[PDB]
Amino acid sequence: ENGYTYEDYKNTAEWLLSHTKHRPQVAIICGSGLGGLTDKLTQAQIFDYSEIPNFPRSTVPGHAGRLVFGFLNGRACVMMQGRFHMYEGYPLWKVTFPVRVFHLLGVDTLVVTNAAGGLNPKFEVGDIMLIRDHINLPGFSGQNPLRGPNDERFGDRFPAMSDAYDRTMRQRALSTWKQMGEQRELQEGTYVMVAGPSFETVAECRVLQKLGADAVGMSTVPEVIVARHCGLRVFGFSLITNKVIMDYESLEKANHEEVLAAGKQAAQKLEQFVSILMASIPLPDKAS
Amino acid sequence: ENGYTYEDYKNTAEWLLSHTKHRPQVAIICGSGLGGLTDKLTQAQIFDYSEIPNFPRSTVPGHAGRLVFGFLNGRACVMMQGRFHMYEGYPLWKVTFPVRVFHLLGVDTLVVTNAAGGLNPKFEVGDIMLIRDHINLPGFSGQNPLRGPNDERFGDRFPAMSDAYDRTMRQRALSTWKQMGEQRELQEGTYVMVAGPSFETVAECRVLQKLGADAVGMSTVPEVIVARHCGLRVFGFSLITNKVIMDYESLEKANHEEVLAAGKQAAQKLEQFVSILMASIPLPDKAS
Amino acid sequence: ENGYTYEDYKNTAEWLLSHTKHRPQVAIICGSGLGGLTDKLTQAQIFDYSEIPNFPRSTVPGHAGRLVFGFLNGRACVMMQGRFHMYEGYPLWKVTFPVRVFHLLGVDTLVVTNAAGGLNPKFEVGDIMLIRDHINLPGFSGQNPLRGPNDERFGDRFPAMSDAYDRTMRQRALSTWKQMGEQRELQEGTYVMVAGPSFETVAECRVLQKLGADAVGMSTVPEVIVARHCGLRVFGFSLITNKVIMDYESLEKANHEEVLAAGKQAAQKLEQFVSILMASIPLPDKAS
Ligand SMILES: Nc1nc(O)c2[nH]nnc2n1
Ligand SMILES: Nc1nc(O)c2[nH]nnc2n1
Ligand SMILES: Nc1nc(O)c2[nH]nnc2n1
C-alpha cells in the first residue's frame, strides 16, 4: 500500500495513456530469461520505467527493465520487461505498483511468468509449470503488498486468494498445450515464493517439499495478490530452470549459471505458448 | 518495542487512571464481531483511542475502535473494542501497545478474542475454539512485538511462551462450558497467526494444517506475547467464522462476507461465555 | 545491504588494520556463554565495538560486546565477543556487518557458534551440535542480510547456500572429536533460525521438528549467509543449552535460566574443541 496514493497510480495511468496510442487489455510480466516475449509484440512502444512518473526504476538492470506495449496474438498487451523483486530492496508496494497502474490502464488480465527451482521430483529442468496455486511465505510474516490502509477504490480489505489462478484460463492452458501436440505436458503445481536473494539450502528445499511447494521463486506472488485485489484475471507459468533437494551427495547443488533451463530453447517455448495463449483470453468485447 | 518509551506507557496509564474512576483488573480485547461484549459492561466509560495520549488511533474504523471500561460479571474490566492488526500498517509495537498500558493500569489478566478460519476438520463454523497454543508465523521471521531493546521494567529479554494460555483458566473454561450444559463442547486448538490481510489459498491452508494449526487469524498472538512478557494471566477464545482447505473443487472457498459464523448468534454466545468467565478469573484479593 | 556502503566496510577494515599489528585469517563469532574462547587468545588486542568506526555498538551488553584479536592454536584470529541479533533491533545488515569487514581484513574462514534449543530427541542438553545445514526462516519472509542492491565487489546476487558449512571442515570436525576420544559424539544437525526474542511455544517447537530442524536459535544464519557470499569457509557449532516439544505435560518448558547446558562445563568444552580445530583450518600458506 504505503508510499503511493491513488492520484499516484492515477497520474501514472494517465501519463501512460496520454503518451501511448495503446490501451492495454492484457499485462504480461516476463520472468528472468522470458523478456524475449517483448520481441513478439507489434506496433510496440517501449517506455523506460525510468521515464514513467512514479514507476520504480531498476536497481541494477534498467536495460532489461523496460515497459513495452504493442500487440500479441490479437490482444492489446503491455509487457513489463524486467520485473521488480523484494530482494532488490523494493518494498512490496513498489514491486506490485505496476499491476495497480495496469488496472487503471484498463488491463483486465495479468499473465505473470517466472523462473523457479524444481522442487517436485517429476519436474525436469526445462519444464514449464502452470501455476495452479501459491504459498506466500513472505505474506505469512507480514510481507503482503496489501498491508497498510485498504483502498476500497482498488478492492477489498480481505481479498481471497483461493481463486487466484482462474480455473478457466488454466483449462484453456492445459488444452492449448495439447492442441499444439507437445512433448512433456504442461506441468502444474504450486509456486512457493521465498524472498531472499541467496538460494535455498538442502534443508530449506526439503521444507519447501513438505510444505507442498512444487517450484521456488522470489517473485510473482506479490503481483498475483494485488492483481486479484483489483479483480484481474490472473494466470501464469513458471519456467523450471533447475532443481535440488539432496544432502546425500549434493553433486551439483546449483549455482545460478545453471539456471537457464536450456535458455533460448525453453524460454522461447514458454514465450510462444504465452503468445498462443492470447487467443484464449476473453476479449473485453464479451465475445458472442 | 520501538517508538514508545516507558514514560509513554506511563503518561498514558496515568492519563487514563486520572481520567477514569475505574482501575481495571481484566483487559478484554474483542475480536471482529465480538465488540458486542462492551454492551455487557456496567458503569462503563468509553474513551476514544483517538482521545488517549499515545494510543494508536484506528486506520479506518475508529467508530468500532473505542476503549470502554466498566464492569463485567464482578470484574473491573477494560475492553478494547476494535483491535489493531499488523495488516493495517501498525508496527507490532503499536498493535500490542494497549496491553503494555493495561499492565500499568493494574490489569493482571488479559482475555483476547478473535475470528479465525477453521483449519481443523472437526470444527464447524460457529464453533468457539479455546486457544490452547499458538504458532507465531510473523514472529519466526522477525515480526515479534518484543524486538528491540528489552525493557526489564516490563519483563525479560527472552520470555517463554510455552505457558502462554494459563492452564488454570483453560480448565475453568472447559468446566464452565460444561456447567452451562452446552451443545458443541468448547473446542480447543492452536491458533496460527498469519499476517497478511488477503485470505489464505488452498495451498496455504494445507501448510497451516500440516504445521499443526487449528484456526488461522491475523491478530491476538502479538497481544498474547507482550501480555505474557508483563506477567499477565492470558487466555482467549477464537470464534470460528468459516473454514477451508480443498483444491479438489473449492465450491465455496470463502470471500469474507461468509465470515460471521451466524454473526449475532455465535458472537453473542462467545460473549456471554467470556462474561460468565469473569467469575473464574482470580480476584487480586487473593480470595480465601 | 543498506545503510553501509563499500567505503564504510573499507574505512573500518583499514581503521582496524591500521590499529592492530594483527591481520586475522580466522574470524570467530562466539555464541552466548561461549565468549570465554577469548581467554584462549594470545597477543590479544581488544577493541570495543563502540571504538571501531562504523561498527554497530551493543544495545545493552557492550561489556560482553568486544572484538578481540590475537592467536588461537596457530591461527591468527579475531573473535567477536557478543554477537548482534535481529531481536535487539539491529537490521540484519548490521548483524552481519562484522563478517563483511572480516573479509576485507583478510579473514578467509568464519567459525560461528551459538546456543540453541534441542529439537531433535536424540540430543541431550550439553551436547554440541555440528551445524551441517540451516533453515533460514526470517529469510523466507524477506529478512536476508543480502536484500538490497548486490555488491558484486563482495559477491553474487544469488549466492547458493546448499554448500554453506564446508564439507571438509565438518569432516575434520567429526574426526577431531574422535581424535580427542570423547564421550557423546559431536552431534550433527540442522539449525533453524527463528527471529523473535521470546521462546518457542510447544506448538512452535513441533513445527520446527516437522520442518526438519534439530536446534533452534536467533542468530548465526545471517553471518553464515554473507560470509558465504564473500566466499568465506564457514563451519560452526551449536551448544545445546536446553530442549522442549511437549504439550502433554510441559513439566519444565524452560525459562532461560535453564539455558547454560552445564554452563562453564559444556561452554568450556565447545571452546577447547574450536581451539583444537584451528589446526584443521587450511592455512593461507596453501600448505605443501
Ligand atoms: N528460489 C529459487 N530457487 C531455485 O532453485 C531457482 N532456480 N531459478 N530461480 C530460483 N529461485
Ligand atoms: N486468516 C484468516 N483466515 C480465515 O479463513 C478467516 N476467517 N475469519 N478470519 C480469518 N482469518
Ligand atoms: N530459539 C531458541 N530456543 C531455545 O529453546 C533456546 N535455548 N537456548 N537458545 C535458544 N534459542
Domain ranges of chain C: 1-288
Which of C2, C120, C136, C141 is the best mutation test for A, with the most CBs of A within 10 A?
Answer: C141
3-state percent helix, strand, coil for chain C, nearest multiple of 5: 30, 25, 45
One-letter identity of residue A118: G
In degrees and rounded to multiples of 5, residue C71 shows phi and psi of -140, 145
* Bridging pattern class, strands B233-243 and B128-136: antiparallel
Say whether C97 sits in a helix, a strand or coil. helix
Three-state secondary structure call for residue B54: coil
Chain mean position to CA A95: 11
Which ligand minimizes its atom distance to the CA of C158? 1
For B103, the enclosing helix (H) or strand (E) is helix B97-104
Q: Is B17 helix (H, G, I), strand (E, B) or coil?
A: helix
Helices marked H in chain A — which ranges? Answer: 6-17, 92-95, 97-104, 137-141, 167-179, 202-211, 221-230, 263-276
CA angle B165, B166, B171 (to 5 degrees): 105
Q: For domain B1-288, which architecture applies?
A: 3-Layer(aba) Sandwich (3.40)
Terminal Cα distance for chain B, rounded: 38
Whole-number Å distance between alpha carbons of C267 and C261 = 8
Nearest Cα residue to A219 out of A241, A188, A197: A197
Residue A148: which region, alpha, beta or left (left: phi > 0; alpha: psi -120 to 50)? left
Which alpha helices (DSSP H) does chain C contain, by range? 6-17, 92-95, 97-104, 137-141, 167-179, 202-211, 221-230, 263-276
- In one-letter notation, the amino acid at residue B112 is V
Q: Which residues of B26-55 are buried (b: 16+ CB within 10 A; e: fewer)?
A: bbbbbbbbbbbbbebbeebeebebeebebb
3-state helix, strand, coil in chain B (%, to 5): 30, 25, 45
Amino acid at B164: A
Size of interface A-C (CB pairs under 8 A): 113
| DSSP-derived 3-state class of residue A218 | coil
Nearest to C189 by CA among C117, C272, C139: C117
Per the entry, the structure determination technique was X-ray
Distance of residue A114 Cα from the nearest chain B Cα, in angstroms: 19
Contact status of B158 with chain C (Cβ, < 8 Å): yes
Q: What is the CA radius of gyration of chain B?
A: 18
Mutate to test the pocket of ligand 3, among C128, C193, C241, C257 (most ligand atoms within 8 A of CB): C241
Q: Determine whether the interchain pair A194/C133 forms a contact, defined as Cβ–Cβ distance below 8 Å.
A: no
* DSSP string of C1-56, one letter each residue: -TT--HHHHHHHHHHHHTT-S---SEEEEE-TT-GGGGGG-BS--EEETTTSTTPP
Report the amino acid identity of residue C63: H
- Name the minimum distance, in Å, from the CA of C136 to any CA of chain B: 9
Q: Which of B140, B167, B190 to mutate to test the interface with C (most CBs of C within 10 A)?
A: B140
Question: What CA–CA distance (Å, rounded) separates B80 from C14?
Answer: 55
What nine digits make up the cell of C134? 540451516
| Closest partner CB to C198 (pick from B159, B211, B212) | B159
